[PDB]
Amino acid sequence: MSFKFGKNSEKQLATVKPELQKVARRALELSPYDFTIVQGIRTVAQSAQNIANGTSFLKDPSKSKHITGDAIDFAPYINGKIDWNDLEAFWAVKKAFEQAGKELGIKLRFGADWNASGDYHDEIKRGTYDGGHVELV
Template sequence: MFRFSKRSEENLKGVNPALVKVVRRAIELTTVDFMVIEGLRTQERQRQLVRNGTSQTLSSRHLTGHAVDCAPLVKGSIPWNDKSKFKAVSDAMFTAAKELGVKIRWGGDWNENGRSDDEKFYDGPHFELRRQDYP
């Protein structure tokens, strides 16, 4: 079983408690270790990410504590180009969310059709509470 580092725990501060429960349950269920790389964001941080092209919106769910970015860890490094590892984290997150009755959406499948190969903007680390359930 995996556990979060202090850094991951710090990155959960300010995040909606329902999403925190999902993330904490997911780390217990996952087949691949992962870390929370970002939770609550400032407007300036969000503007920087849009400028860098790593985000496409200034109204991110991170700004309200309704999103987290979780990245898999393999031998202490994030395998950015291995979508299968991000999918493994996604599987744990969705299993945890279902157990807890929380509706989430993944940046690796924005249109929620069960596929990542048709996404215009793949954001594998991103998980958010669905707006219709958590405005």
């Protein structure tokens, strides 16, 4: 319990361009259940070695927003352990990210409205981290 950004996590966020990391740190406390950082910024080995597969001409590993450092990925911590199956808590945890961004002013928003347009493309019923990824809006 009371998880905190390790040496790798603290760095990932410490390498972010914007101040989105702020909401993350505060959220860890504000939110009911702690959370562990998974990814924050892309090093010179990630997007660089991303072309290790084969296609070097199509070198452009921008599948996410981490490239622009305007987004990060985290995991909802519960019972002193990672809760990837307990999406229930994910609601109380993520809710802190959106609530923390409004008070801190930091740009924070998830992909919950994008799917509202028609159907659930994020697959919130499946329990995926589709919308989990937080980015600046």
